[PDB]
Design an enzyme around this catalytic site. Structure first.
Site, PDB file in Angstrom:
ATOM      1  N   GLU A   1       0.821  -1.219   0.000  1.00 45.66           N
ATOM      2  CA  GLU A   1       0.000   0.000   0.000  1.00 45.66           C
ATOM      3  C   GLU A   1       0.849   1.261   0.000  1.00 45.66           C
ATOM      4  OE1 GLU A   1      -2.574   1.772  -0.988  1.00 45.66           O
ATOM      5  OE2 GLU A   1      -3.899   0.317   0.056  1.00 45.66           O
TER       6      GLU A   1
ATOM      7  N   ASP B   1      -2.234  -5.227   0.906  1.00 46.75           N
ATOM      8  CA  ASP B   1      -1.593  -4.112   1.606  1.00 46.75           C
ATOM      9  C   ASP B   1      -0.180  -4.434   2.070  1.00 46.75           C
ATOM     10  OD1 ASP B   1      -3.614  -2.089   1.550  1.00 46.75           O
ATOM     11  OD2 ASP B   1      -4.783  -3.421   2.856  1.00 46.75           O
TER      12      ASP B   1
HETATM   13  O1  LIG Z   1      -9.979  -1.376   0.861  1.00 48.93           O
HETATM   14  C1  LIG Z   1      -8.802  -1.339   1.275  1.00 48.93           C
HETATM   15  O2  LIG Z   1      -8.564  -1.253   2.502  1.00 48.93           O
HETATM   16  C2  LIG Z   1      -7.696  -1.207   0.239  1.00 48.93           C
HETATM   17  O3  LIG Z   1      -6.500  -1.231   0.542  1.00 48.93           O
HETATM   18  C3  LIG Z   1      -8.229  -1.356  -1.184  1.00 48.93           C
HETATM   19  C4  LIG Z   1      -7.249  -1.247  -2.357  1.00 48.93           C
HETATM   20  O4  LIG Z   1      -5.899  -1.217  -2.083  1.00 48.93           O
HETATM   21  C5  LIG Z   1      -7.719  -1.401  -3.825  1.00 48.93           C
HETATM   22  C6  LIG Z   1      -7.214  -2.825  -3.877  1.00 48.93           C
HETATM   23  C7  LIG Z   1      -8.225  -3.665  -3.353  1.00 48.93           C
HETATM   24  C8  LIG Z   1      -7.959  -4.425  -2.215  1.00 48.93           C
HETATM   25  C9  LIG Z   1      -8.926  -5.246  -1.650  1.00 48.93           C
HETATM   26  C10 LIG Z   1     -10.186  -5.321  -2.223  1.00 48.93           C
HETATM   27 CL1  LIG Z   1     -11.367  -6.350  -1.510  1.00 48.93          CL
HETATM   28  C11 LIG Z   1     -10.476  -4.567  -3.358  1.00 48.93           C
HETATM   29  C12 LIG Z   1      -9.500  -3.742  -3.918  1.00 48.93           C
HETATM   30  C13 LIG Z   1      -6.705  -0.699  -4.827  1.00 48.93           C
HETATM   31  C14 LIG Z   1      -7.016   0.890  -5.065  1.00 48.93           C
HETATM   32  N1  LIG Z   1      -6.964   1.480  -3.814  1.00 48.93           N
HETATM   33  C15 LIG Z   1      -7.081   2.758  -3.073  1.00 48.93           C
HETATM   34  C16 LIG Z   1      -7.278   2.717  -1.691  1.00 48.93           C
HETATM   35  C17 LIG Z   1      -6.297   2.311  -0.800  1.00 48.93           C
HETATM   36  C18 LIG Z   1      -6.608   2.326   0.561  1.00 48.93           C
HETATM   37  C19 LIG Z   1      -7.845   2.740   1.056  1.00 48.93           C
HETATM   38  C20 LIG Z   1      -8.819   3.148   0.161  1.00 48.93           C
HETATM   39  C21 LIG Z   1      -8.519   3.143  -1.198  1.00 48.93           C
HETATM   40  C22 LIG Z   1      -8.339   0.869  -3.578  1.00 48.93           C
HETATM   41  C23 LIG Z   1      -8.735  -0.563  -4.319  1.00 48.93           C
HETATM   42 MN   LIG Z   2      -6.620  -2.316   2.724  1.00 48.23          MN
HETATM   43 MN   LIG Z   3      -4.568  -1.552  -0.303  1.00 44.60          MN
END
Ligand SMILES: O=C(O)/C(O)=C/C(=O)C1(Cc2ccc(Cl)cc2)CCN(Cc2ccccc2)CC1
Ligand SMILES: [Mn+2]
Ligand SMILES: [Mn+2]
Length: 181
Positions: A65, A93
């Site tokens: 992350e 992450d």
């Molecule tokens: O939901 C989390 O806690 C998280 O880390 C999600 C993500 O890292 C994303 C990757 C992802 C990870 C898990 C799931 Cl279930 C769906 C998508 C990638 C873009 N990322 C941006 C993001 C990072 C952290 C928090 C919100 C958004 C979001 C989709």
């Molecule tokens: Mn996460």
């Molecule tokens: Mn993430």
């Protein structure tokens, strides 16, 4: 009671490296922080929980992350090729060098069990370990394996309680709590 600005709160209460990474995450994904301020705060919070989780045992976790997407996948692929770990469908992450698995960290204002079940449904990967924290101090983890000891996790929860408390103190908590999803 005066209502503060969420952007103000975020810049005042998070480390500027975390804020910068959050900004880059939002810009990379095509979102305006000046409008999606609650989301900005959520991204900072999640980032900080990931960092604290890793810092609970230095040299044990690789952080995924917070990197730009291409680099994040580069790191994931390198880890998989090096360790033989199975490649996840979604970006995780962390990687746990000790338990030999990726970790998805969730931070939610919603009901932890439902949030957990939704994440576990979407991952479609029996490999990645899921660990959910709420702002209320509740947590939920794959196979009831919480990875870190009570003290490390207490540190994370205390930080979350502190964030919720400062937010409520500024009148920010009501909107933040219900803007999720
Ligand atoms: O939901 C989390 O806690 C998280 O880390 C999600 C993500 O890292 C994303 C990757 C992802 C990870 C898990 C799931 Cl279930 C769906 C998508 C990638 C873009 N990322 C941006 C993001 C990072 C952290 C928090 C919100 C958004 C979001 C989709
Ligand atoms: Mn996460
Ligand atoms: Mn993430």
């Amino acid at each position: 009671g005066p209502l503060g600005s969420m952007e103000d709160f975020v810049r005042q209460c998070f480390n500027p490296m975390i804020v910068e990474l959050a900004e880059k995450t939002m810009k990379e994904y095509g979102e305006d922080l000046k409008i999606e301020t609650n989301k900005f705060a959520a991204i900072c919070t999640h980032l900080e929980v990931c960092f604290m989780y890793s810092d609970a045992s230095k040299h044990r976790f690789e952080i995924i992350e917070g990197r730009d997407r291409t680099m994040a996948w580069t790191v994931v692929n390198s880890i998989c090729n090096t360790t033989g770990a199975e490649k996840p469908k979604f970006l995780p992450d962390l990687y746990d060098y000790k338990e030999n698995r990726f970790i998805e960290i969730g931070v939610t204002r919603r009901e932890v069990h439902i949030y957990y079940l939704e994440k576990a449904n979407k991952i479609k990967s029996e490999k990645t370990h899921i660990h959910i924290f709420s702002f209320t101090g509740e947590e939920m983890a794959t196979k009831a394996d919480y990875t870190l000891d009570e003290e490390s996790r207490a540190r994370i929860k205390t930080r979350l309680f502190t964030i919720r408390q400062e937010m409520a103190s500024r009148g920010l908590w009501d909107s933040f709590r219900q803007s999720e999803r």
